[PDB]
């Protein structure tokens, strides 16, 4: 059987991923994640981890946007 | 697809655990007193939350005629109830800090050296499998320290007497496990973790292994002296091997380690004396290490007690299994 | 503070997020390396993140529940915020787990062991009821769980 | 969770003897005919120790590590008591001959080790006409703690001359023992990440010296390893 090598993701492509969450300053951030992820490969890191990384940012940043917003709502009162 | 998480006690974290025990062990006052205070500060942290709970409610519940409501005017009286407990808590927070330090701080210089000990013997596994030991058992013997303390002394003077008496107990529980050969290793590596002052400046790095000048000496040693001079210049020059007069005697003594030149005795570090033997005479190293470790530990012999079982059964219990 | 700090949320959440997913495994010596190394990359030196996520009140409560005071315990404790992938505990000293369950206790939950007559059974119950669950002697990952 | 323990020969001579006598019972040492017979039992215990401690030095101390059980010792005692539970006129003489063949003769097949074995038995129970080392062993009478007392008189430093081995060997063994502990100390410091050596090591120079040795070795006599040899009658 034809063997496919699927290891890793292309750095060019891995920058595009964070950005595409807009559709579903930012540029410094999209680039940053990559570098942190590159820094984790020192211990060893996988694209699944890279993805896992994103979801928690999105989710928890989204959470605290709202936990701060609920906070600010009382402050306003 | 999983988050690998590992709790392994930090020395920082461990020390404080020991501390807690020691607190209870020394005096029951200190723990009952120390603890109960901290609970009330937490309770007061709770009641603080209950103060600030009311604030959300007021603005939200009606959203109008806030000035009119008497329940609002009551909350003023509740601000006082909060402020009473607040002032109680400020007072309680300040009183203890200065007083509790003294109590708590008495033990920590011990615990740090007790914290060193655990993290050393843990490394022991790495050369030889089955050199792995229950954290529990450690603590069970650490418990034995209070039980067997039995000294009549000044507490600040006794702390250091307890560490010394402890190391011996430590050593012997480890030594049950040790293969004859490894005992020596253990002693040394053990000693290293305890005191890094004696091995001051990369002397160790050279020792571990990571001559146009001399005439009288032997050539196998001469390659090794070349190695030595480069690595530690201050020492080689300080040594005055070149004079080669005090060396002439020392060299020719079998059992030479004991008879280190008396001029230099004052001047040279106690460990450096081995750094000597290594390069000079591998003849004597083995015994050298020993007498060195023996002296630094206080134990005349690096080997532990013999094995006889029945003496060893005493210690045992139904809770843990005996492995030989 | 809300205004000027929620503007720093993005980097706040970056850093925080990164830790959990990657440094769940490392020891504090290795962790701290990367903390500083990425913090300096951000330029946000202060607002150290342990106090950030979990407030004063929380820390004391977990102490209260019989969590180890150790900072690694603080660190690990906050990793329970991770829910997307299941957290796996190494806990030679039961207390970390004990705390976990205990805080869990007056709340829906269950507990079992790898090698257990009731294993498969319990599991099925737990999923349907959505009872939150713990397991004791995980020699490795059970295929069944993939 | 275990009370982990080692089961070994005690390292020191004294220590071997300590265990021997610590483990030994009192009343077996102390009888009506108290000294004449018991005197021979200590010589056994001293005998026993030697053999275990020669093992430190090998191959030349002993060809192989021989498993001298503590049973051999207790067996030897069982014997001694027996021969000695005979009324009187018990003979040293075939003690050593039996002991040689039954207990230790199974352990050794080697001529040269048998040779040395004999030497130790002959020494302790004699018959030649053609008691131990003096400073190390001042003699004692029956009483049990007197035997124990001797051990404190015995030095912590144990050395080849008490073995009858050459002096210069101590140095040899100390060199190696030293090197091993250092080695093992060097190991302790770090946990290696590890790497694929197969792609790299073979590429690496590690196998290359072997090749470079050979190159030089036959260049003059390149003809030698090249040349066909006549298979001959």
Written account of the structure:
- This is part of a larger assembly, with 4 copies of chain A.
- Chain A is mainly α and 77 residues long.
- Chain A has 3 helices and no strands.
- In chain A, helix 1 (11-23) packs across helix 2 (27-40).
Layout of secondary structure:
This is part of a larger assembly, with four copies of chain A.
Chain A: H1 11-23, H2 27-40, H3 47-76
- Judged by helices, strands and strand pairing, the structural class of chain A is mainly alpha
Backbone CA Rg of chain A: 17 Å
Helix content of chain A: over 70%
Shape of chain A: elongated
Termini separation of chain A comes to: 67 Å
What is the multimeric organization of the chains shown? Answer: part of a larger assembly
Let me know the number of strands of chain A: 0
- Strand composition percent of chain A: under 5%
User: Could you give a short account of the major beta sheet of chain A?
Assistant: none
Biggest interface: chains and residue counts? B-D, 46 and 35 residues
Given the structure, what is the number of helices of chain A?
3
Helices and strands of chain A, in N-to-C order? HHH
PDB class: motor protein
Keywords: AAA+ protein, motor protein, dynein motor domain
Entry title: Crystal structure of human cytoplasmic dynein 2 motor domain in complex with ADP.Vi
Chains A, B, C, D: Green fluorescent protein/Cytoplasmic dynein 2 heavy chain 1
